[PDB]
């Protein structure tokens, strides 16, 4: 089949429970990509349909700040998802290396993430799993694009119609509405953007407990603050944008298109 004929495989870039990502070259085109490789015989039909779902949602999306899926090739024993190669690693890794970002750098970062998220929302896709582990730097060069990845938990929504679709996401990034079994939709991604923006500016999250019982109570209550001294020199407008994203009521919470016009993003 077409992958073995058209591509050469090189070094491992990343690994999951059920996948390996290797650099590949589309030999006749002289173009590099990242191949996410799944051993199909080791997976259930349920795991297969989750993969088909991910590929289907990725193909809806064409944006400079979203990892593009170029091809999907099912060979005997292995399935290949051919994505953009990105070489700058996870935003999570960048934040640990730098400790935290300047307001200028954090504004530039969250602007690109909001552009990606708005594009998803306009295409009726809710990601549900926004986190720095899931945002990739296109390269290691300064100013390299941040790109949304891992649509394995994403859902398709019908206009603005909401429901409790189910319990999905990453504990520290979960929205109050998801934890309360309230109807949800696009706003869950803006809550995660808030958690991300908080982390960018000081290098730790607004909600953390070893004890998940306490973590979920803390998220549902909107129980975060801005401790001294690190937050004392942070502009009020940066705090205001975080507060508008970490609004417990998902109706009142800032939208992606609204956040893109907030003066902390717009005035640059």
């Amino acid at each position: 089949t077409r992958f073995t004929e058209e591509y050469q495989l090189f070094e491992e870039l990343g690994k999951g429970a059920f996948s390996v990502v290797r650099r590949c070259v589309k030999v006749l085109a002289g173009q590099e990509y990242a191949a996410k490789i799944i051993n199909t015989k080791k997976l259930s039909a349920r795991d297969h349909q989750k993969l088909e779902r991910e590929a289907r949602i990725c193909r809806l999306l064409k944006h400079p700040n979203i990892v593009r899926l170029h091809d999907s090739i099912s060979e005997e024993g292995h399935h290949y998802l051919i994505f953009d190669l990105v070489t700058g690693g996870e935003l999570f890794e960048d934040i640990v290396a730098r400790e935290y970002y300047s307001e200028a750098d954090a504004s530039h970062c969250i602007q690109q993430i909001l552009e990606a998220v708005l594009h998803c929302h306009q295409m009726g896709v809710v990601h549900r799993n926004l986190k720095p582990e899931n945002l990739l730097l296109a390269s290691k060069l300064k100013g390299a694009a941040v790109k949304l990845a891992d649509f394995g938990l994403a859902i398709e929504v019908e206009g603005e119609q909401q429901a409790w679709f189910g319990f999905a996401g990453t504990p520290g990034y979960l929205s109050p509405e998801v934890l309360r079994k309230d109807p949800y939709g696009k706003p869950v991604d803006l809550w995660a953007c808030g958690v991300i923006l908080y982390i960018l500016l000081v290098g730790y999250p607004p909600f953390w407990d070893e004890d998940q019982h306490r973590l979920y109570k803390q998220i549902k209550a909107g129980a975060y603050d801005f401790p001294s001294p690190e937050w004392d020199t942070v502009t009020p407008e940066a705090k205001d944008l975080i507060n508008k994203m970490l609004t417990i009521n998902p109706s009142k919470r800032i939208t992606a298109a609204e956040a893109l016009k907030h003066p902390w993003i717009s005035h640059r």
Binding site: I95, V96, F167, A168, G169, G172, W208, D225, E230
Partner: peptide, 14 residues
């Protein structure tokens, strides 16, 4: 820890 938390990787989904 006085408001400062660790940044800990969260790979595991619910």
């Amino acid at each position: 820890s006085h408001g400062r938390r660790p940044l800990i990787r969260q790979d595991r989904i619910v």
